Amino acid sequence: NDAHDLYFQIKEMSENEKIHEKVLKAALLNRGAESVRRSLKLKELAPQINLLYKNGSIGEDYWKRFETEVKLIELEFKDTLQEAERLQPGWVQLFVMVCKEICFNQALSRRYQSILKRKEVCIKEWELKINNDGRLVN
């Protein structure tokens, strides 16, 4: 469940199929965006996990697993940034802000696209009888 290995798959495909040059930058930007998203998510989830652990409702090994993921994310982001420098020269200071923006933009786009599916669950759950033009015919 990640965009990490998809970039590596596209990279390995590049050496054989002669794909364009911007597909690699697209996959790289997507990976950086996902890394930023996960870093912020962990940064906001740390206190709640800590309190659940102190109260005694999470176990003893999950806390170590969480503290390991906290640094795995930083390692992955540093690797992404090094690859970004390798792929285009002098593109390390703008890459981070561009990723920071695309993260929010694509999250908003997902939330907006979800409403078409969100609309039929409520019809099924409340037993609405709606004809064309969205009006209620009871």
Partner: protein, 190 residues
Amino acid sequence: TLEYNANSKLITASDAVVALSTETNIDQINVLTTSLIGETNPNFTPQPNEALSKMIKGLFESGMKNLQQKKLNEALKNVSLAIEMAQRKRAPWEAFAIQLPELHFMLRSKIDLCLILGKHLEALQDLDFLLGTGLIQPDVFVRKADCLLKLRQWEEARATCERGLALAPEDMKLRALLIETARNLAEYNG
């Protein structure tokens, strides 16, 4: 596995059964690719575009001009096309603080138009998105409770009126909505 088109430069998964996360990621990659192909400068800036904003404003104004003409059906279509173009033809790296307020400003008018027209489920979903994306105002809960009362959901209508009064306790319309909700719920329970 996943195949790469030649003339269209779009990557597609050749597999028969693909997960949802993989499909969302491939769609995002396709969007980034078709944006980078068009954007010519290698060191692109988060500065928003101008021609795209001019076209979106033109579509939105051509949609709003039908309200003065008292044509309520096609103005909604024009506003919907404007919102679709704003969501489709805009690059992901453009500024968030300039991309979100325009969506709010157009979705508000689309909501008003759908509520005047008679579609309450579409309007309710638009209110729910506009409320869950970070816009909490007493002018939203009025419309949300109106929709929930129009499609006969009284517990949620009461909760919405209560949360709307918890933010602006001096409002004069949420009080009438709460009175109507209490009356309908007392007739529903007994």
